[PDB]
Symmetry: C2
Amino acid sequence: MSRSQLTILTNICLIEDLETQRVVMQYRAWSGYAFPGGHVENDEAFAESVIREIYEETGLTIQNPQLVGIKNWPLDTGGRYIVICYKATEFSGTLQSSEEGEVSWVQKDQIPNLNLAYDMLPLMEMMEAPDKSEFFYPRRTEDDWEKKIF
Amino acid sequence: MSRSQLTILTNICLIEDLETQRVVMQYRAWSGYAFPGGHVENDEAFAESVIREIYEETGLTIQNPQLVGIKNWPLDTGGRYIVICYKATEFSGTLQSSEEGEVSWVQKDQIPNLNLAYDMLPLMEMMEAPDKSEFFYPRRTEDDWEKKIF
Ligand SMILES: [Mg+2]
Ligand SMILES: [Mg+2]
């Protein structure tokens, strides 16, 4: 019945242009600059979903997106929010914003200087680390946004 | 309401003893030899779940399990079955079966000679491949068990 009982399936992608050392950032009015991505449709694969969402949100067609981790947290009544995290360096197309947010190429080394969504930097660190694959909020108490990286 | 509307969260782990080149296999009366693992509890992280399930099913405590892919397929009415796939080479303990299946160390090169669960070999191949991370059944028709690897 309640929203806190649901399992929500979403994705994000770190799209990195190796020629320019820039990454696609999206501005979402949690608030701030974050990675683009979206919700998984009922019939589509996880990889199909990230390719489709990225195309819609950025105008870019990514190839062979790589699974780099999972961000997730329990909801209040047995539910869970799930973010499947991808990295893509192979893509084509022209960058184009959508109603879902303004997108831009930001120099990767300048990402920390933006108004970032909460925990963007440790999330990007988990994704980039070859030996880490999960970012979890235990949500042990109602205000607990402490994280665990596995 | 129906079981085909649910999102089911499970894990498996390929536990490889690098000293002996054996892998833990579990016999489940889909039927056949498969990897051990289990269902994710409401409050636990994905990594916590695989460590706990593997301990219960095998007696081994795995350390630092690595995400190597996701096996998944849609269910008939908007649901999805999800298997988070891990590999672990660091562990301790003594192998011990449980009510959930007999476990054994099988030489990795002898795995194909077992009565394996359906698609075990391509699943293991997806997991072992550094550039593949999803095993998906589109379930386009009712008898369609064709697969896609991303
Ligand atoms: Mg989106
Ligand atoms: Mg099990």
